[PDB]
């Protein structure tokens, strides 16, 4: 149908094309990659999935665990939950964590926002993602659902990708991609013995703006997220 034709793009595509080209010219984007052992989260998720759907009415995916860890890291690393004004040379450190979530829709990519995500529990996050994705796909968003974001999470693993260099959109200073969670052979070291284990591993590429965040700051922020996910103390957070 499309093949061999020239057609005017829809408004979402036109806006995305304009915003992404401009975004790269008014920021200094680079992507740092860390690997995280998601096995404990995967086991916790598998064990509690039936009780979660029964009590909260929504499916329990990996995304609310990534959101909870990222939002707590943005509170303890306020330098990342920030915006730079290149005209006045002032940095604004936001008190709210307004978390943008990339949502794939048939008309194009949309980035709705979970406002004040720092006040939400894992069940509330799971419900907000479902509500935003549904309203994004059915033209039921309001303008304020698409603005005010202070950081973004993009699920690049939804379509099989291990990694990407996602584009951040100023005034945001960071966008985290959640790669595909894949079983991999990894090395475990305990009591001086190196051995090979099968673990659920994920790559987390973080695109950050070098105007706001330096490489070591990005590493410290990603280390906080990694340690939270690897310990996986989320049982109480599930409110079952």
């Amino acid at each position: 149908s499309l093949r061999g034709t020239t057609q005017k793009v829809n408004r979402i595509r036109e806006i995305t094309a304009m915003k992404t080209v401009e975004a790269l010219q008014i920021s200094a984007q680079l992507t740092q990659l860390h690997e995280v052992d998601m096995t404990r989260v995967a086991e916790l998720r598998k064990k509690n999935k039936p009780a979660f759907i029964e009590k909260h009415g929504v499916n329990l995916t990996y995304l609310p665990f990534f959101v909870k860890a990222v939002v707590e890291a943005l509170v303890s690393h306020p330098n990342v939950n920030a915006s730079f004004n290149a005209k006045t040379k002032e940095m604004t450190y936001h008190s709210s964590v307004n978390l943008s979530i990339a949502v794939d829709t048939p008309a194009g990519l949309l980035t709705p926002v979970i406002h004040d995500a720092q006040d939400l529990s894992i069940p509330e996050i799971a419900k907000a993602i479902v509500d935003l994705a549904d309203r994004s796909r059915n033209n039921k968003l309001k303008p304020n659902d698409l603005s005010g974001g202070t950081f973004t999470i993009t699920n690049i693993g939804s379509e099989g990708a291990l990694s990407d260099t996602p584009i951040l959109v100023p005034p945001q200073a960071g966008i985290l991609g959640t790669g595909a969670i894949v079983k991999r052979p990894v090395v475990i070291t305990e009591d001086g013995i190196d051995s090979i284990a099968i673990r659920q591993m994920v790559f987390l590429p973080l695109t950050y703006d070098h105007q706001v965040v330096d490489g070591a700051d990005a590493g410290r922020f990603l280390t906080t997220i990694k340690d939270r996910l690897e310990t996986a103390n989320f049982e109480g957070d599930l409110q079952l």
Copy 2:
């Protein structure tokens, strides 16, 4: 010889320097990475290499398999074999797949084009790559051999790289890198049993223009390529 000197660059270098700096400013480039199990292609290639050289006169490398899978994916994903006009907001979906191939030459990188690649078999692709690389290296190209490309494949694995973030050149919307194919330990899951196998693995970084392709579209396009290569039903395609 070069060390401690200042010299005027040759024309290929001057053009590359100008085109690549400009390309990044008029597009929104990002690179998505997937991993593909090339074992079946490697076994098929090893088994049929002698019969291929004897019948078709050229060596059988991995590149014609990547080209065949990519060209079929560009036909089934017309949204990727496309160009965006930022002035009129129109997308042109090309009917031809004119596949650019990056060729390393002593005077610099050249990107000759296989026009109407969708009409070619694996032997015809193998011969066209050899012809274009030879004419690129011996100053025997014509101007139309270097224009009209709708997508590019760059063999970054030729010099050992696992991955890269290759630069696309508008009006193209995508450029795929074929990383070095390396034996790696990977996890196989069958009948509920996780186990470790040695497989020939490759990383395929795709740089795409966010004006034309969103992240989920890139993932769906790369999934089509991955499934074609992993199944490796190419015996009949070899025309032996």
Copy 3:
């Protein structure tokens, strides 16, 4: 403390913000990734660490090994230790290797320079890194300690990162990141037998300017570094 405030940034942050945004607009940056087996260097380092601190007064980290291999590669690949003037179309191939080292400080990232690094031994490199990092952190640098660099090495593995797409700053044409050195299961092939070994592996992302270096040139340069590190003939270089 920062949360909920707007504050004027310090001078280092203001300069970094300005330089990194501009750098991307006057160059064609891309990042090629190779993997290197650091096991032999790790064993050599562990065995000689006590004798190194006793004789040279400084701790022996992995960074002087990366610096030695990179500096020798910049001498044998003069096309990488070079600067492009886009106005005159002239390439300057530097005779000195002035190696910039990224240093994380509490006030922000600084990039001091080891001038004429090609004339230094591993102990001299180890001492120069310690001196530059100390003076960077205690406001004891002079202006010429921060200029004249021909290439940069950035230790992204200091804060846990496997990889990054570091930003180069013109007139430099390349910046190498040293990822976190991690034990991984890898495939060894000897006498026709494929087997799985535990090795200390590192990813080395190289951001290069496409105005100066093409992808195959970057691969050849990284292959020289990889072969030097994997052979690890550095015993005599330690001067113990």
